[PDB]
Design a protein around this ligand. Structure first.
Ligand code: MG
Ligand code: MG
Ligand code: MG
Ligand code: MG
Ligand code: MG
Ligand code: MG
Ligand code: MG
Ligand code: MG
Ligand code: MG
Ligand code: MG
Ligand code: MG
Ligand code: MG
Ligand code: MG
Ligand code: MG
Ligand code: MG
Ligand code: MG
Ligand code: MG
Ligand code: MG
Ligand code: MG
Ligand code: MG
Lengths: 60, 143, 70, 141, 145, 206, 63, 55, 67, 80
RNA sequence: UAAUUGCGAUAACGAACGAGACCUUAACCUACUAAAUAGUGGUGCUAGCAUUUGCUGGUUAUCCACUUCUUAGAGGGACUAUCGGUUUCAAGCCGAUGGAAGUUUGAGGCAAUAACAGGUCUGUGAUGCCCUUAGACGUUCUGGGCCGCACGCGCGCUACACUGACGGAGCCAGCGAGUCUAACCUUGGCCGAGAGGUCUUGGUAAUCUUGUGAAACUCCGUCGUGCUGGGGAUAGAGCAUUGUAAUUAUUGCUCUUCAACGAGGAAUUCCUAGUAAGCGCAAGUCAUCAGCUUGCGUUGAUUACGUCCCUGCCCUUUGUACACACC
């Protein structure tokens, strides 16, 4: 959870009110043992605006 | 029965092992000891004067016996308390790396510790040995 | 500076003859008998325990407690 | 394997995990006798369930506990908890209901929340003070 | 540690390094009434002079007392480091001193004067009776002088 | 009592006094009775305890404060004046010492002596400021049992604290001292004096 | 000195402009069958026992 | 320069310390105008046509 | 204070009006009823409601309730 | 080539805050009587079948002293 | 009732905004779906102590199984439930039991209509008008200044010690944050009294720093009521770090110097439970500088659970020649 805590006021007068915004980052990972074809088939599709997909290979 | 050091209270053990290293003679004490302070977060030297370097060795041993590996950096943090910044608020402060790095070096020469891979210092096999023996000694003082 | 700080022979003797009838003995008690500063009072405690008069019922630092032997 | 149950306890953010398997009556915390466990002035807090329910009872079992989190009092109230919960879990699956229920009766009738974790939890601070309720000093003029 | 006895050996109050020292005080701290010897300096000096710290200032054999000074006024020969010392790198002979007793007064004097004499702002600042380590002088320090 | 031994072993005096009676640091809860009617209800004693620590939820309701074991109320009250807020381990120990000390003097369940000094120092009646037109006299009142216990706990522990301040007697002795003298009010105790004076003035305006 | 014990049999409410004071009707135990209304200083519920330092004198309001 | 600065008597703490303090040092907020906040100074005025022509 | 808003008290009325057979002195089953027989957007609001349609039912069994 | 733009009409601009604010802008900047401007915005939004809608105009129009208005219609909620 | 929250009375009946609902976080799941970036038991390989099987560890894969502890998806759970007391036996309030939980469950987010000549043109390439515009009020470069000290006022930090200071020893959190076209978070090894230095190293992170071994705290000692070893202002002399730059001393270390302060007049602030208070930490700022803040966890009370006395506000009634509304 990314907090940002700012005074509400552009200037300085007033009782000092504070207001924290937050951005929630959800991360996930699924391990697959598969041939070459399905990997590409399954990564070009299943795309989605707002979801970040990353595919690493290898045991290291 | 059969024994560990974990079977023995900290002060009983460490003061027992302290006396031991003392009662022994085999050591390697720096020599700046007696003029030195143990942390800049401190105010006076140790009051044990002659000795105390045995207390930390015995303590340092036991700490490393109790776990995988530990470096000077960890023990500098372990050992250092709050420093009065005079009129400014207390901050935690790390202790002295010289005391500890030389405690680690001395214990190794005496073969109670060894330069573990991954980093730091692991208890030695011959440390497991002797420590479990004096722990066994101290439980016996209450037979 | 108001005296309690050394051992003036009569003192030692006072400490051996007077500690009976002490149902309670501790640092603060030894000081309160117009003598001994906390330091040599603490030394006295260990040494009156060398044998008799005082029985160790309490443990530790900050607080001692003793009773007449029986 | 033998008969074995694992249980836990919490107080503030301490969480004490027990493993109560069938054995010859040991009681160890992290890796030391339950007779050590200092903060010391509290030691009888963790002996407590043992004496509450009869110092025998443990002859058929082994108990190990590992606490992480919380602090030097939190961890005591957590470990005693998981200990007594572990005793009642074991009878629950292995001994018998009366035995178990007798055991809950003992703990509760005494209780310092031995079987039941305390919901008390830190309240969030809010701007305008160093605490949750406390407020910064003001002046008017 | 022990119950001791002693005859009339120890004397209350003893004089050394040109100043007076209370006898019925632990010798480490008893020494500190001397200017230029703080707790650390005293502690180490006694250790070096092979004296029993457990002792009062009053006990101390005159030979011990003689040693305790000797080291105080030549800390470098008796292997006290130098970072331990209140006047490394003089500024004239550039040696390393530890200035003691009635003498720290003259050196504070000397140093204050060297600044003023050379007209350096710090010195001017001293001559004016102001704060010189650059602290804010609006609100703080108003009784004083 | 039949000793029982298992793998990692429990000490005899621990096995002993425990499984048998459920008594204090090692002091009897049995006997120990409240010599003043009332106060029974607002002085605990039974169910008995090992030490005066407890994750107790005595706050969230008006009177349940009373169900707290009186000894632990006594200790709770030791831990104040800013520098010592929290610090129950500090406090608990002081009590353990105090009770030991008290026992040395004049025998008696030391926990009973505590009971006595409480009962003995709570103002039977008191005073409150009543308007009555600027110049406000002092209308007398009888005071609650609860307020009688509270006040007595506070009175005791405060006098001990100040007596303890700036002097060689340790905090545990002054506490014990106050208690002892207050167990049968010897007017040389800070608490009694105030109790006696508080009832002096209440009486003086009825 | 005579003591005089009276058990609180009813809670009447608060008086005293501040409001710290509580009116209450009590009943003696040593010879019951007679009741008096008193003003308490601390917190109070039913069945508690006031040590009336003197026995015959009740109040009403408080300013 | 600096030479003047140390030489200048009539300077440093001692000389101030021995001077009485102005009373402006212990004054007030001064405020000046605040209970005239609502009484517009501009002398001007909108008019009902121009406001109606706008809103 | 636990005084129930009108939305809750109103919905109980409406339910007890037209499903009095079914509905019982028991909240737990009154709960389940409210799902099958009414649409409510939050578990909390439904619980709130069913707990009070229960209350109203419990005292109906002992004389009428106006409304 | 590694970046690509596509236009898209919007399904009824009538339910779009941003579209309708920009309408007021273009309404007023084109010389429309404030009330005419805001109502037409309100009534066209409603006519696109909104549940409700509200227009505030704040600032100075022709008179020196600044003012404000609320032009609302239909149903709105304001919290949670 | 926290609430124009409801009951009830009733020329009203039935509704909508705001309140509530809703949302976020903290609490409960041995029920669900799982996990070598979390962890348990077993098994090997293995060290120590005992030896009678035991006890305590090592081994980012030597294999097998599991999901209690951790993580976060989907559900479930509480509705002041059951019982009782009280009450116009109405809304409700009170106690007892059960319960993870029964003070709006605890703490927040959001929040109608309306008012103020509240503050902000010094956040904005938001802006009207006025001013200025080449000897500039544009801009940039060098240097100084915002820190200047008879003194008044406010938020604070550290303290007046023995529930303590000091010295050894025990030794436990939670919220966080970190380096690409860069030099951020730093374990480990050496050197150094320290501050720090140096050689390497892991980490774009549940993977490494980090179990952030934090501080109060706990234990054993020294000191022993003495402005003392409480207190650490002021000042001298030296060593280093950030930076192009440290003088008016950025900060860090070391020795020395060792002030006021002995609980604070009139006054005045804040607060009801994991709260007050004590205690430290991460984050913001940040090249370097926290005695500040935003949060976090640790230790953990006393006393109310009431009222209208003070003070502040709200509501009725009532007066008005006010309506630009007592400025
Ligand atoms: Mg530490
Ligand atoms: Mg330490
Ligand atoms: Mg000196
Ligand atoms: Mg300053
Ligand atoms: Mg402090
Ligand atoms: Mg709404
Ligand atoms: Mg809301
Ligand atoms: Mg699970
Ligand atoms: Mg209950
Ligand atoms: Mg204005
Ligand atoms: Mg602006
Ligand atoms: Mg400024
Ligand atoms: Mg402020
Ligand atoms: Mg300490
Ligand atoms: Mg060097
Ligand atoms: Mg790399
Ligand atoms: Mg001093
Ligand atoms: Mg100091
Ligand atoms: Mg910072
Ligand atoms: Mg700031």
């Amino acid at each position: 959870v990314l907090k940002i805590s700012t005074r509400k006021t552009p200037n300085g007068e007033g009782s000092k009110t504070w207001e924290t915004y937050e951005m929630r980052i959800h991360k996930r990972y699924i391990d697959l043992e598969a041939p070459v074809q399905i990997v590409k088939r399954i990564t070009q599709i299943t795309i989605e605006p707002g979801v970040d997909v990353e595919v690493v290979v290898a045991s290291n | 029965p059969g024994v560990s050091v974990r079977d023995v209270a900290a002060q009983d053990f460490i003061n027992a092992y302290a006396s031991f290293l003392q009662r022994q003679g085999k050591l390697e004490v720096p020599g700046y000891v007696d003029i030195v302070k143990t942390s800049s977060g401190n105010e006076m030297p140790p009051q044990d004067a002659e000795g105390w370097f045995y207390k930390r060795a015995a303590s340092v041993a036991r700490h490393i016996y109790m776990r995988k590996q530990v470096g000077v950096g960890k023990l500098n943090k372990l050992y250092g308390g709050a420093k009065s910044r005079g009129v400014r608020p207390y901050k935690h402060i790390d202790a002295s790396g010289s005391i500890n790095r030389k405690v680690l070096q001395a214990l190794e020469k005496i073969g109670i510790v060894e330069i573990s891979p991954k980093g730091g210092r692991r208890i030695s096999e011959n440390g497991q040995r002797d420590l479990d023996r004096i722990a066994a000694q101290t439980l016996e003082e209450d037979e | 500076a108001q005296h309690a700080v050394i051992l003036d022979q009569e003192k030692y003797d006072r400490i051996l003859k007077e500690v009976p009838t002490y149902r309670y003995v501790s640092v603060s008690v030894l000081v309160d008998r117009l003598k001994i500063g906390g330091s040599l009072a603490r030394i006295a405690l260990r040494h009156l325990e060398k044998e008799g008069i005082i029985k160790p019922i309490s443990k530790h630092s900050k607080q001692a407690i003793y009773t007449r032997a029986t | 394997a033998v008969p074995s149950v694992q249980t836990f306890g919490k107080k503030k953010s301490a969480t004490a995990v027990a493993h109560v398997k069938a054995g010859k009556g040991l009681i160890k915390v992290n890796g030391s006798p339950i007779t050590l466990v200092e903060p010391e002035i509290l030691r009888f807090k963790v002996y407590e369930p043992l004496l509450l329910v009869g110092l025998d009872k443990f002859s058929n079992i082994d108990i190990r506990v590992r606490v992480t989190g919380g602090g030097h009092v939190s961890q005591v109230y957590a470990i005693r908890q998981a200990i007594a919960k572990g005793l009642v879990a074991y009878h629950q699956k292995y001994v018998d209901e009366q035995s178990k229920n007798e055991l809950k009766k003992a703990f509760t009738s005494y209780d310092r929340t031995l079987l039941i974790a305390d919901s008390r939890r830190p309240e969030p601070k809010k701007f305008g003070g160093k605490g949750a309720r406390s407020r910064f000093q003001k002046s008017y003029r | 540690s022990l119950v001791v006895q002693e005859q009339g050996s120890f004397q209350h109050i003893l004089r050394l390094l040109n100043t007076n020292v209370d006898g019925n005080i632990k010798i480490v701290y008893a020494l500190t009434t001397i200017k230029g010897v703080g707790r650390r300096y005293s502690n180490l000096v006694c250790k070096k002079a092979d004296v029993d710290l457990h002792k009062r200032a009053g006990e101390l054999t005159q030979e011990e007392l003689e040693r305790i000074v000797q080291i105080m006024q030549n800390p470098t020969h008796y292997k006290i480091p130098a970072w331990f010392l209140n006047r490394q790198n003089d500024i004239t002979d550039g040696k390393d001193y530890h200035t003691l007793a009635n003498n720290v007064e003259s050196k504070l004097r000397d140093d204050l004067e060297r600044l003023k004499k050379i007209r350096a702002h710090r010195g001017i600042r001293h001559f004016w009776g102001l704060r010189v380590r650059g602290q804010h002088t609006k609100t703080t320090g108003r009784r004083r002088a | 009592f039949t000793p029982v031994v298992l793998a990692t072993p429990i000490p005899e005096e621990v096995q002993q006094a425990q499984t048998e009676i459920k008594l204090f640091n090692k002091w009897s809860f049995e006997e120990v009775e409240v010599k003043d009617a009332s106060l029974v209800d607002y002085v605990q004693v039974r169910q008995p305890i090992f030490v005066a620590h407890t994750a107790g939820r005595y706050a969230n309701k008006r009177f349940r404060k009373a169900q707290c074991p009186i000894i632990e109320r006594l200790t709770n009250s030791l831990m104040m004046n800013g520098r010592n807020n929290g610090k129950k381990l500090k406090a608990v120990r002081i009590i353990k010492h105090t009770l030991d000390i008290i026992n040395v003097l004049t025998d008696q369940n030391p926990i009973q002596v505590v009971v006595d000094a409480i009962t003995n120092t709570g103002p039977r009646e008191d005073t409150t400021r009543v308007g009555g037109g600027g110049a406000a006299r002092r209308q007398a009142v009888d005071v609650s049992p609860l307020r009688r216990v509270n006040q007595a706990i506070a009175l005791l522990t405060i006098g001990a604290r100040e007596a303890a301040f700036r002097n060689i007697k340790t905090i545990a002795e002054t506490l014990a001292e106050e208690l002892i003298n207050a167990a049968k009010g010897s007017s040389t105790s800070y608490a009694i004096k105030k109790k006696d004076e508080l009832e002096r003035v209440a009486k003086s305006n009825r | 000195t005579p003591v005089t014990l009276a058990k609180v049999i009813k809670v009447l409410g608060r008086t005293g402009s501040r409001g710290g004071v509580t009116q209450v009707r009590v009943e003696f135990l040593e010879d019951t069958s007679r009741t008096i209304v008193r003003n308490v200083k601390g917190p109070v519920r039913e069945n508690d026992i006031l040590v009336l330092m003197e026995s015959e004198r009740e109040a009403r309001r408080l300013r | 320069g600096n030479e003047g600065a140390i030489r200048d008597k009539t300077a440093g703490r001692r000389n101030n310390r021995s001077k009485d303090v102005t009373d402006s040092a212990t004054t007030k907020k001064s405020n000046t105008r605040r209970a005239t906040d609502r009484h517009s100074r501009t002398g001007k005025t909108d008019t009902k046509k121009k406001v109606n022509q706008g809103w | 204070g636990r005084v129930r808003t009108k939305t809750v008290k109103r919905a109980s009325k409406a339910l007890i009006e037209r499903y009095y057979p079914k509905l019982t002195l028991d909240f737990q089953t009154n709960k389940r009823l409210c799902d099958e027989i009414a649409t409510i957007q939050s578990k909390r609001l439904r619980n709130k409601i069913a707990g009070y349609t229960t209350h109203l039912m419990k005292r109906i069994q002992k004389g009428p309730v106006r409304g | 080539g590694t970046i690509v733009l596509y236009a898209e009409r919007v399904q009824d601009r009538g339910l779009s805050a941003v579209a309708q604010a920009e309408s007021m802008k273009f309404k007023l900047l084109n010389g429309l009587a404030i009330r005419r401007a805001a109502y037409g915005v309100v009534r066209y939004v409603m006519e696109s079948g909104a549940k409700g809608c509200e227009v505030v105009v704040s600032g100075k129009l022709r008179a020196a002293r600044a003012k404000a208005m609320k032009f609302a219609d239909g149903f709105l909620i304001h919290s949670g």
